[PDB]
Design a protein around this ligand. Sequence first.
Ligand SMILES: O=C(c1cc(Cn2c(=O)[nH]c(=O)c3ccccc32)ccc1F)N1CCN(CC(F)(F)F)CC1
Length: 351
Amino acid sequence: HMKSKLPKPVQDLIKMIFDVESMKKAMVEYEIDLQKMPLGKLSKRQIQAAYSILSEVQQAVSQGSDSQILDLSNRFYTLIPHDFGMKKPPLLNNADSVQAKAEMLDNLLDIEVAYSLLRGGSDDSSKDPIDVNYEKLKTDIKVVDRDSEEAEIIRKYVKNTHATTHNAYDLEVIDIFKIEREGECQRYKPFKQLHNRRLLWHGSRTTNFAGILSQGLRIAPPEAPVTGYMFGKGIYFADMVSKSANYCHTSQGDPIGLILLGEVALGNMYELKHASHISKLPKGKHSVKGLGKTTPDPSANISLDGVDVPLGTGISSGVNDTSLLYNEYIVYDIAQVNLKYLLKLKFNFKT
Ligand SMILES: O=C(c1cc(Cn2c(=O)[nH]c(=O)c3ccccc32)ccc1F)N1CCN(CC(F)(F)F)CC1
């Protein structure tokens, strides 16, 4: 084929995100049975129905028996086959089980998108499939130059916001990309001038990235159990790189991850300290801020293209009896995010 004119790092990025074997690896990591539920048999309506059953299990847990629950638990395993042999699978009887499976279903939702892009589409052996796959993202991706001003600010954000409690690894920034999802600038227009616009981190496993870049960051669907998400069904960000970077789920065995930087229109924050499984915001609020015990030093906030970058070292927030060690931000309308950058990270596991 014609061999592809995209920069090496952009090509390596497309290779990672569309990797089929990585998709399967993630599925077995969640205990799915690939013989009963292969990648190609994944569908939306099956994920949705599984989300529904998990909402049934949530109802029964909220109202308190291991016996009346057995039936609900079993229905979930009927819909999403797990790898337990001739079995008896573990009982889904608590809040932890609902959170754990809801996460699993979130990931399947993005993997189904990635796989559908790979199998929709046309087949032309004279084209570099790198080029073919890039185009399916409907996202302009450029390499940010190491000596630019935006590179220096991003590297400082990474450098300053690695929490001491996440010191089991550190991060090197391998490549910084600037990304522009088609139509997203247009979608964000209503919020483009809102107060409290912040540049924030969103980490996810590499196998979700094709979905995120084609569809943007999305909210978990109606069917999904609201209780599976600490502040309900929104899009979640951090101001500490290490808190987002933990959601990459990298390891010694695959230590390259991907992390986003999004412009997030927070406006008037509904500030909270403990779990609140809300489905709408109080009138007049635009976001939730989960209040951390530690925050980037407010006084070291800097500007990048008109947007606040909270890149200070962590200090005490002064907030007292909170569930959260670090800040968390949630928006509940997809149009309040505009994705700006994508970092490829190398994780040095010190353990
Ligand atoms: O932002 C999230 C989300 C993400 C997390 C976990 N999480 C996370 O995965 N990455 C983070 O950087 C993060 C930062 C602060 C707090 C939580 C974070 C927990 C609940 C959530 F609702 N979602 C849910 C999965 N969504 C995909 C879909 F299933 F709905 F499609 C993307 C939006």
